[PDB]
Each structure stands twice: as structure tokens, then as C-alpha cells.
């Protein structure tokens with residue numbers, strides 16, 4: 001299901017609060033009703049001199065499988081957003097497949113504070129949208145998102161009741177992979 005185009009970079013968020021530690025997705029919203037599988041995800045985003053690089057993990061809770069990626073792209077000047085190319089790696093961060101240059105994802109930060117964040121991610125494989133997901137993030141696994149981030153969900157036009165909560169899914173994480 002095609003990504004929403006009504007996402008725009010925000011000015012005025014604090015990037016130091018976003019590019020810090022690791023994030024766990026506590027709640028996710030894929031409006032596509034054709035999907036069945038639910039995921040857990042964690043990632044650790046960094047920024048140096050305008051380049052964003054991040055280590056990413058997905059766990060398919062239905063299939064009990066996982067995959068790992070490293071993304072890299074430029075920090076937008078217009079707001080807290082970046083469009084990254086991604087390679088596939090193993091749990092030891094060895095490269096399994098270099099990036100497919102036709103593929104990218106755009107991550108747009110909607111809110112970020114010391115405990116929590118809200119982001120939107122659209123993954124594109126050339127002219128096909130793999131899909132988009134809104135993710136509520138916290139630094140601690142299974143934590144409660146802040147009031148400020150919960151407000152951002154509403155103010156994005158969304159309802160938190162519609163998100164899937166990951167704390168009940170039986171997630172397996174790889175915390176060594178996302179560690180500092």
C-alpha cells in the first residue's frame with residue numbers, strides 16, 4: 001500500500017534528542033489491512049557532519065525470523081528527515097548484500113524528547129512503495145511513550161488506539177547489535 005505523501009520535514013525539533021542511544025518501537029501503525037505479520041524493531045541512529053548512519057533490526061513475530069540492515073544518507077537541511085540507502089548485514093554487522101541503489105527509505109521525525117520519539121518511515125524499492133509505518137519509539141524496551149510524543153501522534157492525524165503495541169508480541173531483540 002503506497003506511502004502517505006502528506007509527511008513533511010519539521011523545523012524546530014532537537015536532533016540531539018533523536019540521534020541518541022537506541023530506539024525500540026513500542027507502537028506501530030501500518031494502515032494496510034492486507035498485512036498479517038507483526039514486527040518488533042529496534043535501531044540506533046547517529047549523525048556526523050550531515051551524514052546519518054543507523055543500524056536497524058526487524059523481528060517478524062509471526063514467522064520468528066529476523067533481519068538486519070545498515071542505512072546511510074544525508075540529513076536534510078529543511079528539517080529532521082533523511083533518505084537512506086540500506087545494506088543487509090548479519091548480526092555481526094558483516095555485509096551480506098550491498099545496497100540496491102534503486103531502493104531507499106525516507107525517515108521523518110515528528111517529535112523527539114529525552115525518552116521517546118515519533119517517526120514515519122517510507123520504504124521504496126525503485127518505483128514500488130514497500131510501504132510506510134508510523135512508529136512510536138522509546139529508549140527502553142516496553143516503556144511508556146511520553147505525553148509529548150503521544151500528543152504528536154494525535155497531531156499527526158492519527159489515533160494511538162489503532163497502533164499495534166509491541167510489548168505483548170513476544171519480541172526477540174538483539175541488543176548487542178544496537179548497543180553503543
Ligand code: HEM
Nearest residue numbers: 025028039040041043056069086088105107121123133135
Ligand atoms: C514495528 C515497526 C516496523 C514494521 C511493522 C516494519 C515492517 C516492515 C516490513 C513488513 C518489511 C518487509 C520485510 C520483507 O518482506 O522483507 C520491512 C522492511 C524494511 N523496513 Fe521496516 N518495519 C518497521 C520498522 C522499521 C524502521 C524503524 C525502519 C527504519 C529505521 C524500517 C526500515 C525498513 C527497511 C529499510 C526495510 C527493507 C529491508 C530490506 O529489504 O533489506 N522499518 N519493514
